[PDB]
Amino acid sequence: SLFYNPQKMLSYDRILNFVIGARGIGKSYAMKVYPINRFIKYGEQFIYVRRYKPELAKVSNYFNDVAQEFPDHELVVKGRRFYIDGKLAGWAIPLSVWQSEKSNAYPNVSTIVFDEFIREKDNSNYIPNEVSALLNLMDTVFRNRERVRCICLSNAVSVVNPYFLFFNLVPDVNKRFNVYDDALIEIPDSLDFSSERRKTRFGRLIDGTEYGEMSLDNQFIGDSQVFIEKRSKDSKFVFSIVYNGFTLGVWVDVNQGLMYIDTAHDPSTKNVYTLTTDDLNENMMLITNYKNNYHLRKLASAFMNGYLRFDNQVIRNIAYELFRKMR
């Protein structure tokens, strides 16, 4: 229709929601309105994490775009702290020092009111194992099973970040929702996609054809990282290349001859190959530079040809990295 619409998100009611998309397109609008809606219901204060410190000196105008939502009551900021009719609204700090905070009492939380949790092609900002950092954040904003409901929100859809495959978060382009125990993967309506992208086509025609590029398309639809042709089949296990601690094997199916890189196990006790000394112990055999091109002659040739086929994205990435290592 018109704008970002959190109704279904609020409806299906995960204790922890997980939405993605709409870069600046109201992905923050409704979710910054909602804490003040809880305040008009007179609920609890919210917690605002920030990625870094300078990002804080300018952001005191957080309620400007929610006045046109709720003109009625007083929505202001005294400084660092947010005040609704003078009552405390948001505990607002970047990441650097949450540990010093974690001994404080945090009895009142309402909702997760941050977005751009993860930025595409941005890991200089990142902190090592920040997934467990969010774990510490959540347990230092938990008192019981209630008062809390969380969201993630990345600008675009990817399948490579650790959080997803750590939770096997798999996107679906045919259907909007992907459901798990507590994890949802979603996107606004494909019909709403048509309406809003057509709205952008209307007006600034250059800003429409820029969306005609996949550059602005992938930000909201999230068709990314599916690059190589990929399949699977029922062949016999033949070879396995232990690299940096992986039980990768090769299925070779002669009928419609293609090599499928699916993962499996048989008690071969032979033909298992290691390209590094760290993965070598006293039951497998080491292979120097060239001898891969000869013993894995089928592998080498099928890679040079189009005959090599793949199964999974993680396998694809690690195998291409190996293909870079093999010289």
Ligand X SMILES: Nc1ncnc2c1ncn2[C@@H]1O[C@H](COP(=O)(O)OP(=O)(O)OP(O)(O)=S)[C@@H](O)[C@H]1O
Q: Contact residues for Mg ion (CB under 5 A)?
A: 28, 115
Q: Which of 81, 198, 204, 236 binds a copy of itself (CB under 8 A)?
A: 204
Answer with the entry of ligand X, RNA, a copy of itself, none that 85 interacts with (C-beta below 5 to 8 A by kind).
none
Q: How far apart are CA 83 and CA 34, in angstroms?
A: 15
Query: Which of 3, 12, 52, 227 is in the footprint of RNA by CB under 7 A?
Result: 12
Q: Which of 195, 209, 268, 301 binds RNA (CB under 7 A)?
A: 268
Site for a copy of itself in 90-109 (CB under 8 A): none
Read out DSSP for 47-106? EEEES-SGGGSSTT-TTHHHHTT--SS-EEE-SSSEEETTEE-EEEEESTTHHHHTTS--
DSSP 152: -
Q: Is 26 annotated as a binding residue?
A: yes
**270-274 long-range contacts, CB within 8 A, separation 24+:** 271/238, 271/239, 271/240, 272/239, 272/240, 272/241, 272/242, 273/239, 273/240, 273/241, 273/242, 274/241, 274/242, 274/243
Q: Binding site annotation covers 224?
A: no
d(CA 243, CA 290): 16
Q: Does residue 176 contact residue 144 with C-beta atoms inside 8 Å?
A: no
Among 8, 14, 16, 25, binds ligand X (CB under 6 A): 25
Residue 132 contact, options RNA, a copy of itself, ligand X, none, Cβ 5-8 Å cut-off depending on partner type: a copy of itself
Distances (CA, A) of 154 to 118, 160, 194, 226: 6, 13, 21, 18
User: What is the distance between the alpha carbons of residues 318 and 227, in angstroms, rounded to a whole number?
Assistant: 14
162 touches ligand X (CB under 6 A): no
Candidate segments 25-33, 99-107, 267-275, 282-290, binder of a copy of itself by CB under 8 A: 282-290
Q: Select the span of 20-28, 41-49, 189-197, 266-274 touching ligand X (CB under 6 A).
A: 20-28
* Three-state DSSP state, 189: coil
Q: Which is nearer to RNA, 37 or 158 (CB)?
A: 37
Q: Is 257 annotated as a binding residue?
A: no
Q: Under the criterion CB under 6 A, does residue 34 sit at the interface with ligand X?
A: no
Q: Which does 216 bind (CB under 5 to 8 A by kind): Mg ion, ligand X, a copy of itself, none?
A: a copy of itself
Closest to RNA by CB, 1 vs 104, is 1
Told to check if 327 binds a copy of itself by CB under 8 A, we report yes
- CA 143 distance to own-chain centroid: 27
If one asks whether residue 261 binds ligand X (CB under 6 A), the answer comes out as no
- Size, binding site for RNA by CB under 7 A: 23
- C-beta closer to Mg ion: residue 20 or 275: 20
In this chain, which of 13, 72, 181, 234 binds a copy of itself, going by CB under 8 A?
A: 181
According to DSSP, the β-strands at 249-253 and 236-242 are antiparallel
Cα–Cα distance measured from residue 261 to residue 164, given in angstroms and rounded to the nearest whole number: 22
Instruction: Estimate to the nearest angstrom the gap between the alpha carbon of 102 and the chain centroid.
Output: 26
CB 137 within 8 A of CB 98: yes
* 27 labeled part of a ligand binding site: yes
What's the min distance (Å) between Cβ of 75 and RNA?
17
**In the complex, least distance from residue 45 CB atom to RNA, rounded to whole angstroms:** 15
Residue 62 binds ligand X (CB under 6 A):
no
In the annotated binding site for ATP, the residues are 21-28
